[PDB]
Symmetry: C2
Subunit: 215 residues, 2 copies
C-alpha cells in the first residue's frame, strides 16, 4: 500500500555541471536532469516537470540543504507531496555503470548531459540478461493503474460496504446481525461473517436505498 506514489531522488556531484535523478522507488523509471546551477527553486521546476510524466505522492530527500530551500518545501505543498525525513548507493553506482556506458558514449557526446539522459534511456527500455517476465525498465504505470482500477474497485467496495443487509436464519426468533455480503443474486444472496461464516437465499435477503457516509 506504501510503495505506490513514492519517488526517491539522488543529487549527483559530477565533473562539470551537478545533476539530480528522480525514480519512483519501485518503478526504477529514471528522469534525471542535469543541473545548470543548484537552488531548491531550480530543483523545483524540474520536480514540477517530473509530476506530469508521473504523479508522486511524496519524495524522501537525500540532502537537508536541498530540503532547506523554502521553494523546495513550497513545492511539496502545491504537489501535496510531503518531504519525507547500500542498494540506492548501488543505484547511484548503477548510474555510475550508466556513467561507464556514458563513458562508452563519452566519446560519442561532448555534452555530459546528453550522456546522462541517454543513461536514463538506458535504465529505460532495458531487459535483464537473466530471463525476466517483466522488465524493470518496463516499470509498470499499470501496476499503478491496477491500483487505479483498485481505487475504483474500493469505490465499488465502499458502496457495498455502505449497504447493510440483515437476514433471519429460517425459523429463528433471533434475526441475524449486519455483516458484509459476499454476493447479490435474484436467485440467492451471499454473505460474509468475521469470526463466523454464513451465506443466504435472496428472499431472506432484502434491498436497501443508498445511505451515504461523510459525503
Amino acid at each position: 500500500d506504501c510503495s505506490p506514489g513514492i519517488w526517491q531522488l539522488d543529487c549527483t556531484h559530477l565533473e562539470g555541471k551537478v545533476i539530480l535523478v528522480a525514480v519512483h522507488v519501485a518503478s526504477g523509471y529514471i528522469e534525471a536532469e542535469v543541473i545548470p546551477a543548484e537552488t531548491g527553486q531550480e530543483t523545483a521546476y524540474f520536480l514540477l516537470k517530473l509530476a506530469g510524466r508521473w504523479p508522486v505522492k511524496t519524495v524522501h530527500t537525500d540532502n537537508g540543504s536541498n530540503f532547506t530551500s523554502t521553494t523546495v518545501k513550497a513545492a511539496c505543498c502545491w504537489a501535496g507531496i510531503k518531504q519525507e525525513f547500500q542498494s540506492q548507493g548501488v543505484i547511484e553506482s548503477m548510474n555510475k555503470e550508466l556513467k561507464k556506458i556514458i563513458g562508452q558514449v563519452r566519446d560519442q557526446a561532448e555534452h555530459l548531459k546528453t550522456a546522462v539522459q541517454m543513461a536514463v534511456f538506458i535504465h529505460n527500455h532495458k531487459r535483464k540478461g537473466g530471463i525476466g517476465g517483466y522488465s524493470a525498465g518496463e516499470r509498470i504505470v499499470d501496476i499503478i493503474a491496477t491500483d487505479i482500477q483498485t481505487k475504483e474497485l474500493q469505490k465499488q467496495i465502499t458502496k457495498i460496504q455502505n449497504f447493510r443487509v440483515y437476514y433471519r436464519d429460517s425459523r429463528d426468533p433471533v434475526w441475524k446481525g449486519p455483516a458484509k455480503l459476499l454476493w447479490k443474486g435474484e436467485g440467492a444472496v451471499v454473505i460474509q461473517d468475521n469470526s463466523d461464516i454464513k451465506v443466504v437465499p435472496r428472499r431472506k435477503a432484502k434491498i436497501i436505498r443508498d445511505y451515504g457516509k461523510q459525503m
Copy 2:
C-alpha cells in the same frame, strides 16, 4: 502502434519559444521551455521524452529543428521514426488550449516557463469524458498497460503460433492436417485448422513445434 507515435508542433510565445511534446494517443503532452532553441536542442527534450516512454514515430512534413539532420539521428538512436479529420482540427486547438490556460496561469505565476509546466499537470488531470473519469491524462497509464499486456501475450502467441499439432479425426481416414493449437487442457487440447475451430483428447495427438524445437 497508435501508442507508439507522438506528434509535435511548437509555437514561440512572448518571443521565448516553448518546446512541446504531445503523445497523440495518450493526449498527454510534455513541453519544456528551452534556454535556447535549436534542432539539437529539440533533440535533447526528445531524448528525455524517450526516457519516460518509447515512441515508435513522430511526423513533421518539415521542421527547422527537423531540417537539422541532427534531430533525425537522435530519433534513430531512439528507434523512433521521423515522418482523422476531426482530429486534424483538434491538434492546433490543443496547442491553443494550453495558452488560454496559460493566460489564467499567468495571473497566477511570476515566471511563464514554470507556468506552462504548471498548465500540464492540470491538463492531464482534467477529464473530458464523464463524472466518472476518461481524461486523456488518465487514459495513458492504461493505454500503456494495454500495449504492455499485448506484448507478453503476443509473444505467448508467437511461441504458441509456432508450436503445432496433428489430428487423427477418424483413425482410418488419413489422420490429419496439423493445425496450430488454440489451447491445452488435461486429456485434451483446443486446436483449429484455419478452416474450423476444433477440439480433441490428449491421446489423439502429440505437440512439438510443427517446425519443431528449433533451439532458436
